[PDB]
Amino acid sequence: NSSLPSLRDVFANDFRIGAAVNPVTIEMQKQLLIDHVNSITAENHMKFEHLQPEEGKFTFQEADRIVDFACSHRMAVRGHTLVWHNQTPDWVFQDGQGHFVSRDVLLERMKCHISTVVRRYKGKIYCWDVINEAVADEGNELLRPSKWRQIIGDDFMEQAFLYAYEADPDALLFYNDYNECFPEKREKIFALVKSLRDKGIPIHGIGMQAHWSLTRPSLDEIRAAIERYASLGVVLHITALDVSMFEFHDRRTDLAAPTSEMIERQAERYGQIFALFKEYRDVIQSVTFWGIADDHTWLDNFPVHGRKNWPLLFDEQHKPKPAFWRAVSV
Numbered sequence: 412n413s414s415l416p417s418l419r420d421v422f423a424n425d426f427r428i429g430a431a432v433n434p435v436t437i438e439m440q441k442q443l444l445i446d447h448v449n450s451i452t453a454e455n456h457m458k459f460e461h462l463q464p465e466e467g468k469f470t471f472q473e474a475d476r477i478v479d480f481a482c483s484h485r486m487a488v489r490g491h492t493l494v495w496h497n498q499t500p501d502w503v504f505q506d507g508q509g510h511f512v513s514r515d516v517l518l519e520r521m522k523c524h525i526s527t528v529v530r531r532y533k534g535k536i537y538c539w540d541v542i543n544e545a546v547a548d549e550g551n552e553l554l555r556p557s558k559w560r561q562i563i564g565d566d567f568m569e570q571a572f573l574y575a576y577e578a579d580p581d582a583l584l585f586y587n588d589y590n591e592c593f594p595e596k597r598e599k600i601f602a603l604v605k606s607l608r609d610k611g612i613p614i615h616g617i618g619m620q621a622h623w624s625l626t627r628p629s630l631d632e633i634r635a636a637i638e639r640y641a642s643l644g645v646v647l648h649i650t651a652l653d654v655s656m657f658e659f660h661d662r663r664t665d666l667a668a669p670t671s672e673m674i675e676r677q678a679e680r681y682g683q684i685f686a687l688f689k690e691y692r693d694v695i696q697s698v699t700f701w702g703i704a705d706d707h708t709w710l711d712n713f714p715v716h717g718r719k720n721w722p723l724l725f726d727e728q729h730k731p732k733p734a735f736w737r738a739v740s741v
């Protein structure tokens with residue numbers, strides 16, 4: 412790596428380069444992070460269940476460790492995530508009798524959580540994914556079902572953004588989602604954010620998770636999504652980038668290693684992706700990978716538990732893959 416280009420330096424005039432981490436991977440991949448990224452995101456430790464597991468019981472230890480690491484290396488930090496239909500404790504929506512709480516009570520709980528968490532990291536975390544995956548991923552409906560929406564109503568997102576803005580008015584607030592480039596969902600996300608912006612709601616950016624495959628979404632779809640979202644006047648962050656070696660329909664579990672064809676196509680794919688991102692450097696301000704090296708990736712167990720995937724720029728031995736070279740030479 413002595414002669415190896417540094418990702419953050421290569422893209423210094425285009426966008427920050429980040430990685431999702433946890434105390435364990437920070438240790439395991441410490442040198443890679445130190446040499447390549449200038450932004451950090453907590454893979455799981457800043458989610459509701461890991462910050463307030465029980466009402467009134469806040470567990471900031473792991474999150475604090477991640478933030479300390481980032482700050483000691485002058486890396487920015489993205490907060491992920493405040494309001495989501497996943498990884499949120501049941502206590503949040505229930506009362507003493509186990510029955511669902513009212514709209515006003517849930518809003519109080521939402522405001523308290525957001526206020527406590529955001530205020531703790533004010534000045535250290537520059538942006539927050541306030542609402543995560545609220546848009547439906549299937550069907551004709553605009554919104555996905557969730558207890559937040561069920562109890563509060565469809566304006567639960569408006570409230571979440573307002574509470575976060577109040578907690579830290581200097582933070583960039585994001586609506587974050589996946590499958591963001593498929594036309595049907597793109598239009599739903601566009602419509603949603605436009606509606607909020609049209610109401611004066613403090614939403615400053617759209618986070619494109621970019622959990623992509625070798626084939627999907629197409630480069631044209633990515634370009635169209637970038638332009639569509641950028642037209643709203645919001646900042647864009649690619650927040651959880653990875654390029655799976657398996658398409659959604661491919662649920663094989665016998666591959667002990669990727670084929671030369673997979674590795675080659677992945678390299679081309681990453682080169683095309685970054686060439687496109689660089690083209691839109693004026694609207695894209697940060698690109699975060701959901702991890703950094705193939706020795707750790709959530710794709711090893713999702714959507715198929717127990718297999719192995721090789722979705723990032725560095726291999727299991729922390730050595731640059733062909734995708735690395737195409738990515739940095741755009």
Ligand code: NA
Pocket residue numbers: 424425426691692693694695696697
């Ligand atoms: Na930029």
